[PDB]
Design a protein around this ligand. Sequence first.
Ligand SMILES: CCCCCCCCCCCCCCCCCC(=O)OC[C@H](CO[C@@H]1O[C@H](CO[C@H]2O[C@H](CO)[C@H](O)[C@H](O)[C@H]2O)[C@H](O)[C@H](O)[C@H]1O)OC(=O)CCCCCCCCCCCCCCCCC
Ligand SMILES: CCCCCCCCCCCCCCCCCC(=O)OC[C@H](CO[C@@H]1O[C@H](CO[C@H]2O[C@H](CO)[C@H](O)[C@H](O)[C@H]2O)[C@H](O)[C@H](O)[C@H]1O)OC(=O)CCCCCCCCCCCCCCCCC
Ligand SMILES: CCCCCCCCCCCCCCCC(=O)OC[C@H](CO[C@@H]1O[C@H](CS(=O)(=O)O)[C@@H](O)[C@H](O)[C@H]1O)OC(=O)CCCCCCCCCCCCCCC
Ligand code: SF4
Ligand code: SF4
Ligand code: SF4
Lengths: 206, 193, 55, 393, 361, 147, 110
Amino acid sequence: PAILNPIARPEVPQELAENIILTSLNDVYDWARLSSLWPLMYGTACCFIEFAAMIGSRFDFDRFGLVPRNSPRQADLIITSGTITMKMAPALVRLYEQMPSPKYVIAMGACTITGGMFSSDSYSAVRGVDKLIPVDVYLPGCPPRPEAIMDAIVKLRKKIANEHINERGNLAQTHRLFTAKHKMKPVPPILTGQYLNAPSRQAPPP
Amino acid sequence: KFLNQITNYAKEAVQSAKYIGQGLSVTFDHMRRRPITVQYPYEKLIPSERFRGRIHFEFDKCIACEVCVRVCPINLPVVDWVFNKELKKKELKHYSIDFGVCIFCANCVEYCPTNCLSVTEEYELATYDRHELNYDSVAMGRIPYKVTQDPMVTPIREFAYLPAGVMSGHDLPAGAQRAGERPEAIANTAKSS
Amino acid sequence: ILPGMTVKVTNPNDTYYQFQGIVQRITDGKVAVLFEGGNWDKLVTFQASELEPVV
Amino acid sequence: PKIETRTEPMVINMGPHHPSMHGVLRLMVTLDGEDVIDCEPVIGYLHRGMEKIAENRTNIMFIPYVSRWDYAAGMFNEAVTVNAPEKLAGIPVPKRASYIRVIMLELNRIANHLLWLGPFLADVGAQTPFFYIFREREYIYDLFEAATGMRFINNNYFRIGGVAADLTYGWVTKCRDFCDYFLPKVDEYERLITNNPIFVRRLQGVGKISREEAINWGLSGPMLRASGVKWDLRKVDHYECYDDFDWDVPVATEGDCLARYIVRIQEMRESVKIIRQALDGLPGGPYENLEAKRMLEGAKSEWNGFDYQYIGKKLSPTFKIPKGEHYVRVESGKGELGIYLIGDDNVFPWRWKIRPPDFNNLQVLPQLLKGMKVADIVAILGSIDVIMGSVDR
Amino acid sequence: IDLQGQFISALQSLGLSHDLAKLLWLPLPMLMMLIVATVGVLVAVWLERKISAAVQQRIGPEYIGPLGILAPLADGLKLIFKEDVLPANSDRWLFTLGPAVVVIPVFLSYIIVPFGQNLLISNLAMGVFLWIALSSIAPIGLLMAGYASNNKYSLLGGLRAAAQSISYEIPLALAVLAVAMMSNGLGTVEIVEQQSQWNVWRQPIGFLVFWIAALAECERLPFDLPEAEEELVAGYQTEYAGMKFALFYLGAYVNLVLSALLVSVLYFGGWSFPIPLETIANLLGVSETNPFLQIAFAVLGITMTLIKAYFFVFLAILLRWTVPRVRIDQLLDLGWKFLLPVGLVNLLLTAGLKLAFPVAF
Amino acid sequence: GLLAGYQFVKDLESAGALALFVPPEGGFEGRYQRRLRSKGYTTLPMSAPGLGDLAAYLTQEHGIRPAHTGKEDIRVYFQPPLVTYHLENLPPNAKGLVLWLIDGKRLSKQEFAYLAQLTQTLPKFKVVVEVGGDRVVRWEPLADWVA
Amino acid sequence: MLLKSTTRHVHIYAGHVVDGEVHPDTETLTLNVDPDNELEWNEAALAKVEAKFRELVANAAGEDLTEYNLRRIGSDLEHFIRSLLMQGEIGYNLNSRVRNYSLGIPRVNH
Ligand SMILES: CCCCCCCCCCCCCCCCCC(=O)OC[C@H](CO[C@@H]1O[C@H](CO[C@H]2O[C@H](CO)[C@H](O)[C@H](O)[C@H]2O)[C@H](O)[C@H](O)[C@H]1O)OC(=O)CCCCCCCCCCCCCCCCC
Ligand SMILES: CCCCCCCCCCCCCCCCCC(=O)OC[C@H](CO[C@@H]1O[C@H](CO[C@H]2O[C@H](CO)[C@H](O)[C@H](O)[C@H]2O)[C@H](O)[C@H](O)[C@H]1O)OC(=O)CCCCCCCCCCCCCCCCC
Ligand SMILES: CCCCCCCCCCCCCCCC(=O)OC[C@H](CO[C@@H]1O[C@H](CS(=O)(=O)O)[C@@H](O)[C@H](O)[C@H]1O)OC(=O)CCCCCCCCCCCCCCC
Ligand code: SF4
Ligand code: SF4
Ligand code: SF4
């Protein structure tokens, strides 16, 4: 109990590389990667609109190479814009894990870094996305000026330019997985088609 | 019976061709106009006079009445007072605001009685660690950014500070004023006849 | 130019031209002027040369 | 590795990840060969609990919250939130504040219709107009950011006894400039678009509600006025400073996506008339003129009167709304907003309920998809102007 | 000059089995055309991103290189280093093969792109007909990308892609048919040498049909159905991540520079600075063995080919942001209901005019 | 000159506190941090606008007060010194610990002088402060650039 | 279809991972503590977490297999993980990854 929430204090110090050729090639590996980030077209709530304003002509993130992508397979950056309720939290983790490994996260708006104005007396909003996925950059503010989203992009580019090709080991998932039988009465799914063809829609009960 | 159908087909096809040619001409015209893009990192857009940025806190003016905590939508500002016993004076020990939870509605700045709390034009907050967004009583003053006093940024006014008739703020002279006269000037003119 | 004084802004190339405020804090040669007006007290930093200590 | 085709109705999930601006909506839809048998819309992916929050926040603490139900225009819902306790307390709003409120609501209606118009034209065509609305939608952002603190939503510019503060100095002239620069383009839209025969046959007869079924299904918005009902809460309720301006409540008769588009464009065009008619008639005119008159003679003169103030008496954050329920309403961009405030004796209300227009216009998604096509799903979605922020309550 | 003559002669001067020298030269043009195709792809990506920005009062990539010149390089190198995913129950071998079958025959059709006479890889006797035959393998690639997926989202996209690429193959062939009627043959050099003083002025309907059919090869926003983001997420591409997706991203712009060059050579001509240049006997140049005049006219021909290829690349990526999309059924009515009848009519008209007035045809 | 050697690390080891002048696009200074990290130095960037006295946060302890929002009456945390705690948690063969400050423009000349002086004492501790500026990634000792 | 409770450093599913897939089963309740390696683990701590998971899935379960109950189990597992991290049995990773202290900052236990 000396220091609560302690740190690792690891061993086997770095095993990093030094020769000029490999670091010069790492320079290109990191330049190609940070100057062509493709965000996922993913909005949930208010902040998305400012993100869309960041797409528009008034100031587009097309420069420094950002092209919004629809499927997560081609996306390498998810700018989480909007409040994430408990109904949709697993719908985000999925979209995050369903997306190639050299990937990044930006939590924009107050509702994705601490819960925001809903951090009190709300029973459905996830109080920050940092408890769902590994956020890289936080920008505060109900809807942040779309030249603050670009400031977050600057601070994310200067973080991407830091990576090391001799360090991509800290990029896989360890998968410490277990198993335990249960007895819990599987129920039928209550979410199917059958909205207008349902028998209760066609005639009132006697 | 069959000729009317064909004349309708022709009147539809030629119309669809003209209404594509017109759009083609409009788009080919659009690429002559100057881009409205505000090239942010080197052309930062100077904010308004009421823009609600980061909160600024003057430790010396605070009297610890906690109205900032009371009119806050989420009771955010942490105020730690101790109530010294000289005669009745409250003493401030730590004022803070978690700007990660902040909403930037500035109700706190509206109801500060002592003008101890103000808004700024710092919209460029971003960190790698949200625990670094909790501002001490000292990290809050810090003399705001002032985009204009930046050697690598050409400030660009927004639509409300451009002279009459002007729409964009890119190719602007060095002597423009907002839109009209201020009240003191109008009163001075009315003073002389 | 000292804190607490009421000042005006004399710089035709600024959005806060001919505004009047009160000096809240001065550090490193630059000042911070608070314009109490509208609804939310604004605070912006000016150089020591873009002011004038109005009486 | 395959999907094993079989002769059944196929169910497809246009799930929460909509790569568009139509919020988060799931829409499990089944189809029999490029038709629609029935769809089950799964709303709720943005329910943050505004109704339970409103019961625990005082009014000025809750007024920043409201700018979220139906993002866009984040001043309609501010207007109804201000009107709710204002009516119970019977607090009189001055006329200048009423004119500023009218101007803000009309600019917000224009912005709402622009935000609806962009992705609508995108889903029935090209992606360039999305870059044109946001060139035209920014000129209103930059007017809000002068008047109130921020851009669109999180303005909290409204107050119970009026409006948080007067306009800036060079504001009326610049709003005039914007109106004169924008009014030709609401018609330039119908010039560059709305006449492509392929584009008008696309939404010619897809989506349809009879006048007698839109009343039954409660489609308060322009979805009603597109079905031949000359009825908007601005002329039937005599909203605050109306009957002081000319009125052409636009209505179509067929009740289809094309009718919705036409009504929305004519309404966006009438909003500019309302704004230009109010601007020339503020109780005090532009704020620099009013301030000059007040500093020249308004020490005691009539220019310092109650009818020329931006607010009534400034109220404490402990307003303590009185006892007694009632239902308030405002004709927003998507139709009628409704707050069924109750209140018992204190600052915290009792059952602050929100009646959003999109929540009722969305009830006929299945009826409007009664076997139309698989392709006109997005057009019917865009014809309703769905905003999931107003589908949380 | 005849660089081939000099190469084979200087290589045979030191022995090396003269017949073997001719085998040691094939890689030279076989990779010069690869170089120009890759540069054309980079140019097409850059032009799209920088012209769509000008059309919309915007600025394209500007922080990559001086003018965003390095933007396609970055977008390619990123997709190289990206982790590739192969979903749970998808097939393992038709997956990694779709994006290659949709690409190999698009590259192979560069045999027939002239860039001036004696400046092309092996002017073939089948020429444009070989291209018509080779452009029919990509639908197999799309069906392969759709069949090898556990995603019913993307099988429906592969089907509607393979059903659009076959709808615009009959009119695309009936336009080249009318061109080959006048051209007396099928080889591209023999097709273009009939312009000795342009086919667009005598085939004003076949030009329209050819151009529309080529733009409707699942390429441009006029159609681009399997890429139409809003109606469906990327169609069949929705599951490819690294270089496998870059093969789609790349095989769609090379399939555009190719079509631009082909419209140029069919209806305009990769030669002929408009005046009948080869009647520049007024400078008394002995072209025949003029050591230069040869290089001067080579440069003129290359420039005149690239001008008219860039004209159509520009016009295609301009129509992308001008013409509204059609659902899928307004698309399949262009072919088989408007383009196929008009193609047949143009063919019959060219036949009637060639039988009646054999001069000028 | 489009590719850099290791002069940055030598200059940091010599001066102790540098003051970068990165271009305002932020993708061309990360390679210098990677050069630093490849030598043995460990970095930790903490976005200067958000630290306190810079002496209570770096050297001494300081009581962080989290955001109670109506619940959970005021509580302090006392997080350990952001430097003395990271000098103990260095990897086995670590050449030192350099401190990266992203938005150095917000600090004042007094705080810059303090950060410069702190490098001489407290041995295994260098400082880089990205004061905004020039269109090329140039550096300059932090003892200079002030007064 | 799967039924899962996926949060940071806890991932409960309703199937059996045979080689990397999931294969919904209706009684396996797999668990995937800390995939992204926010923390550094030991052999004793992982055993404690597995034991807690077992006594949480077995000793208290006769209810439905709705996603509500799966979330209710995952929440308790994550509270247990946070308690382990508070007591000091485990610690943050400190590696060159994102390093955002999602479970709290290090404090000094005054
Ligand atoms: C990414 C896209 C861009 C990337 C660039 C491509 C990478 C290559 C970079 C190297 C560039 C250096 C080459 C210098 C160009 C001059 C070489 C030339 O013109 O050589 C031409 C010769 C000509 O060949 C001979 O040409 C003769 C006559 O010309 C004939 O050419 C045509 C056929 O009839 C015409 O119709 C003409 O009338 C006709 O007479 C005969 O046809 C012979 O049979 C034939 O062998 O071919 C040859 O070796 C040419 C073979 C090499 C091909 C490379 C050409 C590159 C294009 C450069 C154009 C420069 C434009 C101006 C530059 C300055 C700016 C103003
Ligand atoms: C021991 C290990 C060995 C391993 C081998 C691997 C190592 C590789 C060796 C080095 C790599 C070099 C690669 C390129 C070198 C250039 C070779 C060349 O110059 O090769 C020359 C070739 C060959 O064709 C030329 O052909 C004529 C000769 O006739 C014969 O040439 C051809 C071959 O027979 C045809 O069959 C022709 O009909 C036939 O008659 C010429 O006079 C020359 O003799 C002959 O070489 O040129 C052509 O093929 C024409 C194609 C080029 C045309 C250029 C147009 C350029 C495009 C514009 C550039 C800008 C583009 C950017 C914008 C793009 C947007 C669209
Ligand atoms: C069919 C065949 C086809 C095959 C396909 C071909 C594949 C080609 C792959 C190679 C493409 C690489 C392009 C790189 C372009 C680029 O870097 O962008 C230019 C940018 C622009 O910024 C620059 O930076 C400078 C500022 S600053 O100092 O960096 O801050 C300043 O110069 C200005 O900002 C700008 O100029 O440069 C950088 O930002 C820094 C990145 C450093 C790049 C490393 C240098 C290249 C070395 C190559 C490796 C050689 C190894 C031996 C060396 C000892
Ligand atoms: S972060 Fe702010 S603006 Fe964005 S959705 Fe949440 S409350 Fe609205
Ligand atoms: S700043 Fe104002 S509201 Fe806050 S504690 Fe001080 S006096 Fe009270
Ligand atoms: S900005 Fe809003 S949340 Fe922050 S202290 Fe002021 S009133 Fe409270």
